[PDB]
């Protein structure tokens, strides 16, 4: 009942699975086996985390579900509908991240001058 | 767990004859039970899977049907090859269980 | 063709550690998670565990768990397992059993080896 966890990172997108935390576990994506020996090396699962290298927002996007050694695929009920669009470089910030990140220069910068002004006296 | 057991250790019937070995589960399986072939000196195949569905290289005369907790295995006209002992193993829930086997 | 070929009978001692091999020949080593089952008390067979070869995790019975530790060679296609401390109960022969690699046909051995008897005296 944990949630799905999901980071992406550029192009790079790793899905874990924590409901599980004893056994190996096994992915299925849109009903077609994924992960293990295959032509594709841009997916990989490693423990919990499955790592899709050069995400392809038509290709690789959709339902995924996680289940662990010994549980068929066809008795899972929490499904992740994983759809994200994504590019190399990208990162989301918002208005008030750049706020801060000016507010913090301007106090740095004026720390570092009474900085200087108090050590020369 | 899933105990896998077999209503009879052995069974005796003549040659061409169409013969049923039974298969039970402590609890339901749900169709996925498991039938192999324990020959004499020691090799064994496994001969049909799922509920009823046929492996790749055994011959069609075995045959197997069941569902829930009571599973049979109905091969066909007994042949002098068919004379082995027969295993049905679970696949619902871990561990995989077998079951003690029938002596034909 | 799909083949496991198994070691000889090994005759050990009682408290001691002997290592069983499965060398596999015919197809792709890895795509087949391979299992160890073992035919104590004449003939009665049991499950002991199983190694994803492509991995190294192995999933085991809690029956077995402290008797048996499951190793692979993927260099040279060839399954090991090491029974510690093996005392007179564990004189049986042991079969490595090929079962597919995902969750949906993981369940059944399509290919069996054709036995090691290891003895205990």
């Known amino acids: 009942q944990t949630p799905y966890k999901v980071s992406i990172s550029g192009t790079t997108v790793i899905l874990t699975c924590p409901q599980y935390p004893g056994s190996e576990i096994l992915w299925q994506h849109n009903d077609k086996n994924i992960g293990g020996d295959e032509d594709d090396k841009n997916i990989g699962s490693d423990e919990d985390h499955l790592s899709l290298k050069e995400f392809s927002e038509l290709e690789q996007s959709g339902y995924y579900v996680c289940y662990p050694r010994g549980s068929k695929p066809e008795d899972a009920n929490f499904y992740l509908y994983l759809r994200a669009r994504v590019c190399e470089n990208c990162m989301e910030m918002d208005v008030m991240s750049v706020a801060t990140i000016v507010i913090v220069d301007i106090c740095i910068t004026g720390g570092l001058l009474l900085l200087v002004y108090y050590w020369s006296k | 767990d899933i105990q896998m057991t077999q209503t009879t250790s052995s069974l005796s019937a003549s040659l061409g004859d169409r013969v049923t070995i039974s298969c039970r589960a402590s609890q339901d399986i749900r169709n996925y039970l498991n039938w192999y072939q324990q020959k004499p000196d020691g090799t064994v195949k496994l001969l049909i899977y799922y509920t009823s569905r046929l492996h790749s290289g055994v011959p069609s005369k075995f045959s197997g049907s069941g569902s829930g907790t009571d599973y049979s295995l109905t091969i066909s006209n007994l042949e002098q090859e068919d004379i082995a002992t027969y295993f049905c193993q679970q696949g619902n829930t871990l561990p995989w269980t077998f079951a003690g086997g029938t002596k034909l | 063709e799909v083949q496991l070929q198994q070691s000889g009978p090994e005759l050990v001692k009682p408290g001691a550690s002997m290592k069983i091999s499965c060398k596999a020949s015919?197809?792709?080593?890895?795509?087949?998670?391979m299992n160890w089952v073992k035919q104590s008390h004449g003939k009665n067979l049991e499950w002991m565990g199983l190694?994803?070869?492509?991995?190294?995790?192995?999933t085991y019975n809690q029956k077995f768990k402290d008797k048996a530790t499951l190793t692979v060679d993927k260099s040279s296609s060839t399954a090991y397992m090491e029974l510690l401390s093996l005392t007179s109960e564990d004189s049986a022969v042991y079969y490595c059993?090929?079962?597919?690699?995902?969750?949906?046909?993981?369940?059944?051995?399509?290919?069996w080896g054709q036995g090691t008897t290891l003895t205990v005296f």
């Open positions: 059993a090929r079962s597919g690699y995902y969750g949906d046909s993981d369940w059944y051995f399509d290919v």
């Open positions: 190694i994803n070869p492509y991995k190294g995790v192995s």
């Open positions: 015919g197809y792709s080593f890895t795509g087949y998670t």
